[PDB]
């Protein structure tokens, strides 16, 4: 599923991501924009052989199991395939664990490089929430 901007904002808020660990909803929408272009099916291979999955490009190195990332962990206790669902529940639950890990949203390199410090409220501008 490819979400619309306000549609995703609404789903993230419904799943309790809005202001989670102090990160306003626009931060989460901005991160998703640049991680996956709002596409739940997005997958991208990393040079280290791990793969990133879903709207928030959660990495198989630490967070989910894909059965082909040697030496990795599965700290969200989910198959990475669960992170590609049209329903964002698994991605949200796992993102909550990641963002609580110590470095906040800096875990998402695209968030650090493209969203952090910017006018992230623009991402939820005009949305019925
Ligand atoms: Cl957009
Ligand atoms: Cl915001
Ligand atoms: Cl593995
Ligand atoms: Cl493979
Ligand atoms: Cl694990
Ligand atoms: Cl699994
Ligand atoms: Cl959903
Ligand atoms: Cl923080
Ligand atoms: Na893994």
Q: Can you give the residue ranges of every domain in the chain? A: 1-129
N- to C-terminal Cα separation, the chain: 20
What is the SS3 assignment for the chain? CECCHHHHHHHHHHCCCCCECCECHHHHHHHHHHHHCCECCCEEECCCCCEEECCCCEECCCCCECCCCCCCCCCCCCEHHHHHCCCCHHHHHHHHHHHCCCCHHHHCHHHHHHCCCCCHHHHHCCCCC
Q: Looking only at Cα atoms, what is the longest distance across the chain?
A: 44
119 is catalytic: no
Cα–Cα dist 126/111, whole Å: 22
Cα–Cα dist 44/120, whole Å: 25
Q: Ligand 3 centre and the CA of 53: distance in Å?
A: 14
Which of these is catalytic: 18, 35, 66, 119?
A: 35
Cα–Cα dist 41/5, whole Å: 16
* Residue that is written with structure tokens 């989670």 in the block: 20
Burial of 74 (0-12, 13-18, 19+ CB in 10 A): middle
| Backbone phi, psi, residue 93, to 5° | -55, -45
| CA distances, 92 to each of 26, 103, 119 (Å) | 15, 17, 22
How determined? X-ray
Strand partners, 23: 20
Q: Which ligand is nearest to the CA of 90?
A: 7
Is 66 assigned a ligand-binding role in the annotation? no
| Backbone phi, psi, residue 52, to 5° | -100, 140
What CATH number does the domain located at 1-129 have? Answer: 1.10.530.10
| Backbone phi, psi, residue 112, to 5° | -60, -45
Cα–Cα dist 10/43, whole Å: 23
Cα–Cα dist 107/87, whole Å: 22
CB-based contact 29:102 (threshold 8 Å): no
CB-based contact 94:83 (threshold 8 Å): yes
Q: Which ligand is nearest to the CA of 64?
A: 9
52 is catalytic: yes
Expressed in Å, this structure's resolution amounts to 1.7
């Amino acid at each position: 599923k490819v979400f619309g901007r306000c549609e995703l904002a609404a789903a993230m808020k419904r799943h309790g991501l809005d202001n989670y660990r102090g990160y306003s909803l626009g931060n989460w929408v901005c991160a998703a924009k640049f991680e996956s272009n709002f596409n739940t099916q997005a997958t991208n291979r990393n040079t280290d052989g791990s793969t990133d999955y879903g709207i928030l490009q959660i990495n198989s190195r630490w967070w989910c199991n894909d059965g082909r990332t040697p030496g990795s962990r599965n700290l969200c206790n989910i198959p990475c395939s669960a992170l590609l669902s049209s329903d964002i529940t698994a991605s949200v639950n796992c993102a909550k664990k990641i963002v609580s890990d110590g470095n906040g949203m800096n875990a998402w390199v695209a968030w650090r490089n493209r969203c952090k410090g910017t006018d992230v409220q623009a991402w939820i501008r005009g949305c019925r929430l």
